[PDB]
Design an enzyme around this catalytic site. Structure first.
Site, PDB file in Angstrom:
ATOM      1  N   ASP A 129      -8.211   1.492   8.140  1.00  0.00           N
ATOM      2  CA  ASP A 129      -6.884   2.081   8.081  1.00  0.00           C
ATOM      3  C   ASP A 129      -6.750   3.136   9.177  1.00  0.00           C
ATOM      4  O   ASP A 129      -7.691   3.894   9.435  1.00  0.00           O
ATOM      5  CB  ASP A 129      -6.575   2.640   6.684  1.00  0.00           C
ATOM      6  N   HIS A 153       2.922   8.008  10.625  1.00  0.00           N
ATOM      7  CA  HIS A 153       4.141   8.041   9.828  1.00  0.00           C
ATOM      8  C   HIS A 153       5.290   8.613  10.651  1.00  0.00           C
ATOM      9  O   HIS A 153       6.045   9.449  10.172  1.00  0.00           O
ATOM     10  CB  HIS A 153       3.922   8.808   8.516  1.00  0.00           C
ATOM     11  N   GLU A 159       0.847  -1.183   0.000  1.00  0.00           N
ATOM     12  CA  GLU A 159       0.000   0.000   0.000  1.00  0.00           C
ATOM     13  C   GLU A 159       0.888   1.239   0.000  1.00  0.00           C
ATOM     14  O   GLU A 159       0.723   2.140  -0.827  1.00  0.00           O
ATOM     15  CB  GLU A 159      -0.879   0.035   1.248  1.00  0.00           C
ATOM     16  N   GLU A 160       1.842   1.229   0.942  1.00  0.00           N
ATOM     17  CA  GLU A 160       2.719   2.348   1.228  1.00  0.00           C
ATOM     18  C   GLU A 160       3.592   2.655   0.017  1.00  0.00           C
ATOM     19  O   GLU A 160       3.739   1.831  -0.885  1.00  0.00           O
ATOM     20  CB  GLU A 160       3.569   2.047   2.465  1.00  0.00           C
TER      21      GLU A 160
END
Ligand SMILES: COc1ccc(NC(=S)NCCCn2ccnc2)cc1OC
Ligand SMILES: [Co+2]
Length: 326
Positions: A213, A295, A166-167
């Site tokens: 998420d 993050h 995904e990242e």
């Protein structure tokens, strides 16, 4: 005929009071934490040992359940900023030849970060917690999910997706993000479903993409993102209110509740995108704002909320039962 439209009419079998207490007693946060979550709190960007352990760990958990799960590994190679890579989307299906499927997903990969103060990014909320949360749901609902083997009904079932890659490797961009989801959405788009059908694809199959998420921070606020999902969103608000009213949540106020009536200004990018752009109805359970720790090395276990996640487990499980009529 018009089975792809059954989704548009599909209604929920809303649980009664005691069934809500029953589900509430059903899920265990202590269990999930230890057994579902902790193993995932490891560095697991693609090609890493973590990736494989995570992939093994997720499959290990599912394989040990009674319900007739059917695991499939969607491995493929793609180019990245760092060179060719292998990605492995994990799909998990009950009754896979059933026309319709409710779909919970998250991303199991973590973002890559070089080592700061011997600190490693483990992406707790992002999205290990969703992972475990799905795994807990699989477990907490195993008995009830079992009766889907019994084949009277709507031809509908449950699917899990654990997307990988995904990242972004470098910086977010069409080309550097959503590797797994970009790949599986294309694949689904062009696989006939059910087998030997005309016109219809596996994407016609997805009744609703529920994408978890960035869950695990305390007091999250979720916007109601999409018109064409809004009623299902309103069910989540409905479920939330009901459980609180029944004192079946912990550390919960209706002021500091989870699903808000308001929508969202811009447009958020995630695994759902290549689905939404192909017209999958999407219920995107991402919070706005993101967690503070997003993050950042602080995206860790010290910084999750036990009661928040547990509460969300209860809310989510009810939603699924009610959707599948179990
Ligand atoms: C920190 O505040 C934000 C920053 C950016 C965005 N916008 C977009 S498009 N985000 C894409 C998220 C991709 N992703 C999902 C999991 N890990 C990464 C919104 C934010 O707050 C609402
Ligand atoms: Co992220």
């Amino acid at each position: 005929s018009a089975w792809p439209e059954e989704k548009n009419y599909h209604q929920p079998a809303i649980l009664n009071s005691s069934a809500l207490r029953q589900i509430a007693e059903g899920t265990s946060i202590s269990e999930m934490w230890q057994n579902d979550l902790q193993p995932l709190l490891i560095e697991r960007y693609p090609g890493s040992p973590g990736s494989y352990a995570a992939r093994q760990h997720i499959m290990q958990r599912i394989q040990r359940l009674q319900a007739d799960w059917v695991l499939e590994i969607d491995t493929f190679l793609s180019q990245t900023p760092e060179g060719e890579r292998s990605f492995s989307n994990i799909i998990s299906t009950l009754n896979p030849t059933a026309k319709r499927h409710l779909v919970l997903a998250c991303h199991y990969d973590s973002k890559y970060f070089s080592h700061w103060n011997n600190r490693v990014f483990v992406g707790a909320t992002d999205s290990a917690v969703p992972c475990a949360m799905m795994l807990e749901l699989a477990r907490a609902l195993d008995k009830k999910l079992l009766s889907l083997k019994t084949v009277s009904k709507p031809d509908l079932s449950l699917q899990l997706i654990f997307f990988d890659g995904e990242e972004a490797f470098l910086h977010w961009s069409p080309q550097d993000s959503l590797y797994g989801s970009r790949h599986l959405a294309a694949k689904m788009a062009s696989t006939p479903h059910p087998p030997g059908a005309r016109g219809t694809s596996q994407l016609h199959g997805m009744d609703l993409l529920v994408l978890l998420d960035l869950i695990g921070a305390p007091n999250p606020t979720f916007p109601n993102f999409f018109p064409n999902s809004a009623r299902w969103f309103e069910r989540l608000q409905a479920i939330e209110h009901e459980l609180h009213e029944l004192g079946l949540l912990k550390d919960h106020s209706l002021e500091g509740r989870y699903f808000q009536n308001y929508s969202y200004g811009g447009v958020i990018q995630d695994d759902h995108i290549p689905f939404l752009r192909r017209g999958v109805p999407v219920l995107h359970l991402i919070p706005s704002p993101f967690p503070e720790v997003w993050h950042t090395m602080d995206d860790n276990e010290e910084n999750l909320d036990e009661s928040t996640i547990d509460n969300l487990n209860k809310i989510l499980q009810v939603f699924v039962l009610e959707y599948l009529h179990l």
